[PDB]
Design an enzyme around this catalytic site. Structure first.
Site, PDB file in Angstrom:
ATOM      1  N   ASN A 130     -20.829  12.499  -5.105  1.00 38.29           N
ATOM      2  CA  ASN A 130     -19.523  12.498  -5.755  1.00 38.29           C
ATOM      3  C   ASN A 130     -19.213  13.913  -6.220  1.00 38.29           C
ATOM      4  OD1 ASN A 130     -17.194  12.109  -7.276  1.00 38.29           O
ATOM      5  ND2 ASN A 130     -18.264  11.097  -8.974  1.00 38.29           N
TER       6      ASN A 130
ATOM      7  N   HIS B  30     -21.929  20.020 -10.696  1.00 37.99           N
ATOM      8  CA  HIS B  30     -21.542  18.644 -10.403  1.00 37.99           C
ATOM      9  C   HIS B  30     -20.328  18.228 -11.227  1.00 37.99           C
ATOM     10  CE1 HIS B  30     -21.998  14.282  -9.724  1.00 37.99           C
ATOM     11  NE2 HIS B  30     -21.904  14.151 -11.035  1.00 37.99           N
TER      12      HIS B  30
ATOM     13  N   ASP C 195     -22.972   6.764 -14.912  1.00 37.29           N
ATOM     14  CA  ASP C 195     -24.419   6.721 -14.783  1.00 37.29           C
ATOM     15  C   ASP C 195     -25.118   7.508 -15.889  1.00 37.29           C
ATOM     16  OD1 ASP C 195     -23.078   8.762 -13.416  1.00 37.29           O
ATOM     17  OD2 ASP C 195     -24.713   9.105 -11.989  1.00 37.29           O
TER      18      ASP C 195
ATOM     19  N   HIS D 137     -20.109  10.947 -16.757  1.00 40.63           N
ATOM     20  CA  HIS D 137     -19.950   9.847 -15.811  1.00 40.63           C
ATOM     21  C   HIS D 137     -20.731   8.603 -16.263  1.00 40.63           C
ATOM     22  CE1 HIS D 137     -18.926  12.850 -12.324  1.00 40.63           C
ATOM     23  NE2 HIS D 137     -17.838  12.488 -12.980  1.00 40.63           N
TER      24      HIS D 137
ATOM     25  N   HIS E 133     -23.855  14.383 -18.743  1.00 39.40           N
ATOM     26  CA  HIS E 133     -22.436  14.600 -18.472  1.00 39.40           C
ATOM     27  C   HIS E 133     -21.709  13.266 -18.653  1.00 39.40           C
ATOM     28  CE1 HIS E 133     -23.785  13.552 -14.317  1.00 39.40           C
ATOM     29  NE2 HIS E 133     -22.549  13.121 -14.125  1.00 39.40           N
TER      30      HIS E 133
HETATM   31  C1  LIG Z   1     -26.426   9.802  -4.791  1.00 41.07           C
HETATM   32  C2  LIG Z   1     -25.105  10.523  -5.091  1.00 41.07           C
HETATM   33  C3  LIG Z   1     -23.872   9.649  -5.387  1.00 41.07           C
HETATM   34  N1  LIG Z   1     -23.753   9.261  -6.795  1.00 41.07           N
HETATM   35  C4  LIG Z   1     -23.684   7.997  -7.199  1.00 41.07           C
HETATM   36  C5  LIG Z   1     -23.591   7.985  -8.582  1.00 41.07           C
HETATM   37  N2  LIG Z   1     -23.612   9.247  -8.961  1.00 41.07           N
HETATM   38  C6  LIG Z   1     -23.703  10.037  -7.889  1.00 41.07           C
HETATM   39  C7  LIG Z   1     -23.743  11.577  -7.988  1.00 41.07           C
HETATM   40  O1  LIG Z   1     -23.568  12.339  -6.997  1.00 41.07           O
HETATM   41  O2  LIG Z   1     -23.944  12.128  -9.105  1.00 41.07           O
HETATM   42 ZN   LIG Z   2     -21.869  12.464 -12.259  1.00 41.14          ZN
HETATM   43 ZN   LIG Z   3     -24.463  10.547 -10.523  1.00 46.45          ZN
END
Ligand SMILES: CCCn1ccnc1C(=O)O
Ligand SMILES: [Zn+2]
Ligand SMILES: [Zn+2]
Ligand SMILES: [Zn+2]
Length: 231
Positions: free
Chosen positions: A179, A148, A87, A85, A83
């Protein structure tokens, strides 16, 4: 044992071998005052590697490429971001400059561009409708519906019964929502049901963050998401 957040300093990447030719990669990052672990996947396909998700940032993603060369020594030729984001796409320009062909759905690429996040080059067709599945080399890609985020994909490795649920799936030690700013809370349980019905045979289930488990991670996530919906 699977490396947990406390065991990994920010900047280092661990690889955890799950089966023949299947690994996860684990990194850590500081965010909003806390340190979080993050998971991705590596799947061998002939003599090349398919990467699933970055290691959350350029510095971690460079380290990821270096740990792959050290511990596996096969080239990463394609990557898929699950996705939009940071990360999952943070590090895509590092991958691109190392010669990796980066992929994401058009939905993900559109959303990353809007957020100001790095944008994978190639587009994954055939995944716009809930329940859509496409083969991508050694994995199947599955769009279970919004959860998510509206664009989240899950990845299944049929040779190994490994299901990478990404951030649609919570680890057991997470008993409250993460999140959820981009989430579809109303659809999330239905999308999880689509994952259960499409991969009822999965043995090894990997959340986007934290420790893997079995298919009970789906029920756990449904429990947590519903408790957040009701509070
Ligand atoms: C551990 C959940 C917090 N978080 C930090 C980065 N991404 C998330 C997510 O929920 O996907
Ligand atoms: Zn995410
Ligand atoms: Zn995440
Ligand atoms: Zn639970």
């Amino acid at each position: 044992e699977y490396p947990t957040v406390s065991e990994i300093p920010v900047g280092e990447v661990r690889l955890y071998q799950i089966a023949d030719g299947v690994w996860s990669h684990i990194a850590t990052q500081s965010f909003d005052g806390a340190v979080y672990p993050s998971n991705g996947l590596i799947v061998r396909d002939g003599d090349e590697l398919l990467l699933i998700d970055t290691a959350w940032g350029a510095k971690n993603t460079a380290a990821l490429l270096a740990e792959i060369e050290k511990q596996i020594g096969l080239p990463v030729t394609r990557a898929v971001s699950t996705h939009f984001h940071d990360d999952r796409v943070g590090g895509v320009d590092v991958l691109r400059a190392a010669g990796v062909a980066t992929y994401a759905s058009p939905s993900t690429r559109r959303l990353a561009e809007v957020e100001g996040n790095e944008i994978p080059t190639h587009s994954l067709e055939g995944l716009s409708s809930s329940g859509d599945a496409v083969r991508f080399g050694p994995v199947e890609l599955f769009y279970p519906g919004a959860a998510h985020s509206t664009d989240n994909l899950v990845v299944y490795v049929p040779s190994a019964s490994v299901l990478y649920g990404g951030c649609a799936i919570y680890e057991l030690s997470r008993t409250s929502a993460g999140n959820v700013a981009d989430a579809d809370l109303a659809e999330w349980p239905t999308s999880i049901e689509r994952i259960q019905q499409h991969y009822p045979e999965a043995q090894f289930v990997i959340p986007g963050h934290g420790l893997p488990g079995g298919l009970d991670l789906l029920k756990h996530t449904t429990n947590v998401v519903k408790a957040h919906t009701n509070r």
